[PDB]
Amino acid sequence: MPDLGTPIGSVTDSSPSLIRIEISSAEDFEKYKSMLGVGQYLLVASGNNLYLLASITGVRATHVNFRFQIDTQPIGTLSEDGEFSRGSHSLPVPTEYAYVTP
Amino acid sequence: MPDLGTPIGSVTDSSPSLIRIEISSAEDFEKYKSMLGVGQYLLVASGNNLYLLASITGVRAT
Amino acid sequence: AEYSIKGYLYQFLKYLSEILAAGDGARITIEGAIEDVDVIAAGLTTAVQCKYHEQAEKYTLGKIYKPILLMLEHFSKNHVSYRLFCHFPGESGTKALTKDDLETVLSTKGEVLRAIVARIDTSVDYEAFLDRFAIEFGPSAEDLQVAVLASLKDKGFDPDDIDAVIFPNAIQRIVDLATRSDVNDRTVEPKTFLAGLREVRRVTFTRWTRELATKGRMFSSLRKSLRSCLAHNSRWRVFVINPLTIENFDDDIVRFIKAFVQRYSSKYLHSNPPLFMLTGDYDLSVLQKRLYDAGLRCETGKVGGTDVIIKELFRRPILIRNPFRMEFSLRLAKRDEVIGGPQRRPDELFLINVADDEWKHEDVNVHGFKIERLSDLEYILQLRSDY
Amino acid sequence: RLYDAGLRCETGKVGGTDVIIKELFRRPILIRNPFRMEFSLRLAKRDEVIGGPQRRPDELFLINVADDEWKHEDVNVHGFKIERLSDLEYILQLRSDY
Amino acid sequence: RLYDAGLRCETGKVGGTDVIIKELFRRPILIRNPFRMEFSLRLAKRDEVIGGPQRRPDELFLINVADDEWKHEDVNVHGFKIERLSDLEYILQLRSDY
């Protein structure tokens, strides 16, 4: 429910087992490095109110502008009130934003 | 029967083992998400007056 | 001017108990005290004031100092049949005080009380006050509400609905009956009341209902009722408001629209922004400019300022992903002008402070409300956290 | 009428009766495939527009108007004079015959 | 006036008045996609520029001057006399109408 803040990137592939996110600029990556290594957790939108918690499994980078890719795995869903619910219930569609987990 | 209503999309590959359905609109998916998860069921037309039952085994978006 | 709103409340609760137990053809009447401003003063000027007090174990003039002294001034001004509701454990009798007790009252140990009383004109038929006033030792308010809930159930209804859409609605109808400058008759057939309520399906959020004990569920049932609709991404939503009675409209309507468009219609996939329709003779140019000052852009619909074009108001906007840019994020227009209906029908039509509209139908889920403070609606629409 | 013809326009208004200069000059939202364009032409009266653009123009044609304010040294003034409208279409590479 | 027009200049003056030679004739930065160009034109009053270029000019157009030091055999030295700039705008393919 708190202020998640500003986002870091948008989704480019979605499935029950894999979520593939992309970041456009490098400033954002160098800003949020310490919270994007393996093991940490991110949040993805899956509808106006709900959210989905995802675990990082792979990171990667390439040159030719830049491309930064992140590959993650789902664990469950969380609402505004606070209700947690387990299971890959509702996939997140493309063009939805990602946020970092306080 | 009865009154299955509006469809969601057409096939783009066929075989006894696997079938591959396709969709190209967003609103439809957002409206029918609940019944489009793994385990659920769907009916594919396989003739004038018949129907074939299918059990989902995978989803992808791009 | 404490206003002892809980007093009017207990009184209306008693009236409600009577209306429930009232026999066929028996219509109990009511009187809205000077708290209601009525030049008509219907009912032969039989308005009745009241007050509530508790936490007094045994009856002593000491425990009932302030209220008596207070009623004294109100009568000093100038048929106001003062009635007092109180609960003392072990005493359930009604009696009229005598003169020596009145003098006991006049013996003022607190000098501030004497300062307040000095405003009282000495020349007053204190005996008329005594024989006009009555003292009542009655049950507790909360337990009264509980018995009243049980009785409202006894009639028979969907047990889940009575909690949040029935009891406050009835209290509100009775309150409107109590304080309305419009011509009215407190005599109301108890048999109609039942079905008349059996029909309506709109919630209310007035000041009176705020203090009822049912608050706490009045909010949450609605919050759960509206969750599944808004959860979606692309839907057609419509609004209609009456700005007459709303409190502090021109100062907070902007905050409303902005807090809405920030969570529901500022993103790519959102491909059908909302609409807001205001009824009356209200101007819109001021609101439009004050919004543009913020960053949002509207879709008035008028190409030429003369009249509305039904087809343009409902068009679909241009969208662009990286970076995001949205031609319009909200619509706005008046009802007396818009003439006709769309091609596709709505999926939600909220009505704030209005009875009916032409778009109403069967397929269109219609939800109605009645409000004074807008900030209460935000809680229903998940915009904010607490009330 | 121009709407009826199939073209939209921008009038630099936010509902009131006064013009704003910042929206009067702005960039439209252009999409390539499929083609689309928000506002194609811009209209307004002079007596209402007060101020000057954030940037200087390049070609300020003038028709039957002697002097105007924006007129400057570093801007091109191709002042003309006409009798009927059909002539300007010959001056601007739209119609062939006189 | 040129900055306001849109273009940018290079004058070969590091702070002070003196006009260095090497900084004036330096090759610019260029980026293909998108097109960006550090400077487009050069400006230098003559009396401030004394010396000679490492490289010779392919063409040297003089306007209303009898002679200059950089006149050389292997360097083409065109010449003219004019009354107003329009004539030159014609002589260098800018205005098809004299």
Q: Which of D74, D76, D78, D91 to mutate to test the interface with E (most CBs of E within 10 A)?
A: D74
What is the spatial distance between Cα C85 and Cα C92, in angstroms, rounded to a whole number? 11
Q: What is the DSSP string of A49-67?
A: S-EEEEEEEEEEEEE--EE
Give how far D42 is from chain E: nearest CA, Å: 24
Report chain C residues whose CB lies below 8 A from the CB of B27: 234, 271
Cis peptide before C190 (omega within 30 of 0): no
Q: Do C269 and B26 touch (CB under 8 A)?
A: yes
List all residues 6 or more positions away from D83 whose beta carbon is below 8 Å from its beta carbon. none
Q: What is the DSSP string of C171-197?
A: HHHHHHHHS-SS---S---HHHHHHHH
The residue length of chain E stands at 98
Asked if C234 has any chain A CB less than 8 Å from its own CB, the reply is no
Written as six digits, the tokens of C337 are: 């002008």
**DSSP annotation of A33:** G
Q: Is chain C adjacent to chain B, meaning 3+ CB pairs within 8 angstroms?
A: yes
From residue A19, give the alpha-carbon distance in Å to each of A22, A34, A73, C104, C322.
Answer: 10, 20, 6, 83, 20
Token pair 């003219």 in the structure block, residue: E80
Token pair 């121009």 in the structure block, residue: D2
**DSSP annotation of A84:** E
Token pair 């006149």 in the structure block, residue: E71
Give how far C239 is from chain A: nearest CA, Å: 19
- C232-235 long-range contacts, CB within 8 A, separation 24+: C232/A47, C232/A48, C232/B30, C232/B31, C233/A47, C233/A48, C233/B30, C233/C269, C233/C270, C234/B26, C234/B27, C234/B30, C234/C269, C234/C270, C234/C271, C234/C272, C235/C272, C235/C347, C235/C348
Give how far B47 is from chain C: nearest CA, Å: 33
Question: Which contiguous run of DSSP H or E holds residue D37?
Answer: strand D36-37
**DSSP annotation of C91:** B
Beta bridge partners of C334: C278
List all residues 6 or more positions away from E32 whose beta carbon is below 8 Å from its beta carbon. none
Number of other CB atoms surrounding residue C54 within 10 Å? 12
Contacting subunits of A (3+ beta carbon pairs below 8 A)? B, C
> Closest partner residue to C230 among A1, A48, A93, by Cβ?
A48
Residue C51, SS3 per DSSP: coil
Q: Are A77 and A46 in contact (CB under 8 A)?
A: yes
**DSSP annotation of C170:** H
Contacting subunits of C (3+ beta carbon pairs below 8 A)? A, B, D
Written as six digits, the tokens of E31 are: 């980026």
Q: Are C20 and C187 in contact (CB under 8 A)?
A: no
Among candidates C363, C226, B17, C121, which has minimal Cα distance to A49? C226
Asked if A62 has any chain C CB less than 8 Å from its own CB, the reply is no
Crossing angle of helices C65-77 and C111-118, rounded to 10°? 10
User: Between vectors from CA C116 to CA C114 and to CA C121, what angle results, nearest 5°?
Assistant: 90
What is the spatial distance between Cα C262 and Cα C74, in angstroms, rounded to a whole number? 51
Q: Do D56 and E1 touch (CB under 8 A)?
A: no
Among candidates C324, C313, C329, which has minimal Cα distance to C265? C329
What is the spatial distance between Cα C157 and Cα C265, in angstroms, rounded to a whole number? 39
User: Between vectors from CA C193 to CA C192 and to CA C198, what angle results, nearest 5°?
Assistant: 95
Q: Are C269 and C305 in contact (CB under 8 A)?
A: no
> Closest partner residue to A14 among B37, B38, B61, by Cβ?
B61
φ/ψ bin of B40: left (φ > 0), alpha (ψ from -120 to 50), beta (otherwise): beta
Crossing angle of helices C5-21 and C167-178, rounded to 10°? 110
Q: Do C325 and D29 touch (CB under 8 A)?
A: yes
Q: Are C311 and C343 in contact (CB under 8 A)?
A: no
Report chain A residues whose CB lies below 8 A from the CB of C233: 47-48
User: Between vectors from CA B19 to CA B13 and to CA B21, what angle results, nearest 5°?
Assistant: 75
Task: Tell me the CB-side half-sphere exposure of residue C127, using CA atoms within 13 A.
Answer: 0
Written as six digits, the tokens of C106 are: 């006049």
Taking CA–CA distances from B31, the nearest residue in chain C reads: C232
Q: Do B62 and A13 touch (CB under 8 A)?
A: yes
Written as six digits, the tokens of E88 are: 């030159």
Q: What are phi and psi of A21, to 5 degrees?
A: -110, 155
Task: Tell me the CB-side half-sphere exposure of residue A47, using CA atoms within 13 A.
Answer: 24
Q: Do C318 and D36 touch (CB under 8 A)?
A: yes
β pairing state of A84-86 and A66-78: antiparallel
List all residues 6 or more positions away from A29 whose beta carbon is below 8 Å from its beta carbon. A23, A36, A61, A68
Q: Are C72 and C40 in contact (CB under 8 A)?
A: no
What is the rounded end-to-end Cα distance, in angstroms, of chain A? 11
Written as six digits, the tokens of C232 are: 């979606």
Q: Are C197 and C166 in contact (CB under 8 A)?
A: yes
Report chain B residues whose CB lies below 8 A from the CB of C316: none
Beta bridge partners of B21: B11
Asked if E97 has any chain D CB less than 8 Å from its own CB, the reply is no
Alpha helices in C263-352 (DSSP H): 285-292, 310-313
Crossing angle of helices C65-77 and C99-106, rounded to 10°? 100
Written as six digits, the tokens of C350 are: 């909220």
Q: Do A49 and C264 touch (CB under 8 A)?
A: no
Q: Are C49 and C82 in contact (CB under 8 A)?
A: yes
Burial of C170 (0-12, 13-18, 19+ CB in 10 A): buried
Q: Are C331 and C260 in contact (CB under 8 A)?
A: no
The residue length of chain B stands at 62
- D88-97 long-range contacts, CB within 8 A, separation 24+: D88/D63
Q: Do C298 and D15 touch (CB under 8 A)?
A: yes
Among candidates C340, C379, C382, which has minimal Cα distance to C358? C340
Token pair 């009745």 in the structure block, residue: C48
φ/ψ bin of A39: left (φ > 0), alpha (ψ from -120 to 50), beta (otherwise): left
Q: Which of C298, C303, C312, C327 to mutate to test the interface with D (most CBs of D within 10 A)?
A: C303
Among candidates C87, C50, C79, which has minimal Cα distance to C67? C50
What is the spatial distance between Cα D48 and Cα C76, in angstroms, rounded to a whole number? 66
Written as six digits, the tokens of D4 are: 């009826």
Give how far C272 is from chain D: nearest CA, Å: 18
What is the spatial distance between Cα A52 and Cα A81, in angstroms, rounded to a whole number? 14
What is the spatial distance between Cα C331 and Cα D93, in angstroms, rounded to a whole number? 41
φ/ψ bin of E74: left (φ > 0), alpha (ψ from -120 to 50), beta (otherwise): alpha
Burial of A46 (0-12, 13-18, 19+ CB in 10 A): buried
Among candidates D17, D11, D28, D21, which has minimal Cα distance to D70? D21
Report helix, strand and coil shares of chain A as percent, to nearest 5: 10, 45, 45
Give how far D75 is from chain E: nearest CA, Å: 9
What is the spatial distance between Cα C300 and Cα C332, in angstroms, rounded to a whole number? 5
Asked if C300 has any chain A CB less than 8 Å from its own CB, the reply is no
Token pair 């009675």 in the structure block, residue: C245
Burial of D68 (0-12, 13-18, 19+ CB in 10 A): exposed
Contacting subunits of E (3+ beta carbon pairs below 8 A)? D
Report chain A residues whose CB lies below 8 A from the CB of C321: 95
Asked if C224 has any chain A CB less than 8 Å from its own CB, the reply is no
What is the spatial distance between Cα C295 and Cα C291, in angstroms, rounded to a whole number? 7
From residue D34, give the alpha-carbon distance in Å to each of A14, C272, C318, D30.
Answer: 27, 20, 12, 10
Cis peptide before B2 (omega within 30 of 0): yes
Q: Are B22 and B9 in contact (CB under 8 A)?
A: yes
Report chain A residues whose CB lies below 8 A from the CB of B26: 93
Number of other CB atoms surrounding residue C212 within 10 Å? 16
List all residues 6 or more positions away from C135 whose beta carbon is below 8 Å from its beta carbon. C84, C86, C94, C95, C96, C97
What is the rounded end-to-end Cα distance, in angstroms, of chain B? 34
Number of other CB atoms surrounding residue B34 within 10 Å? 9
Crossing angle of helices C167-178 and C190-199, rounded to 10°? 130
Interface of D with C in 31-60 (CB under 8 A): 31, 36, 38
Taking CA–CA distances from B25, the nearest residue in chain C reads: C269
List all residues 6 or more positions away from A88 whose beta carbon is below 8 Å from its beta carbon. A16, A17, A74, B38
Token pair 């006049």 in the structure block, residue: C106
Written as six digits, the tokens of C24 are: 């066929």
Token pair 């989704």 in the structure block, residue: A11
Q: How far is CA E90 from the centre of its chain?
A: 19
Q: What is the DSSP string of B5-44?
A: -S----BS---SS---B----HHHHHHHGGGSSTT-EEEE
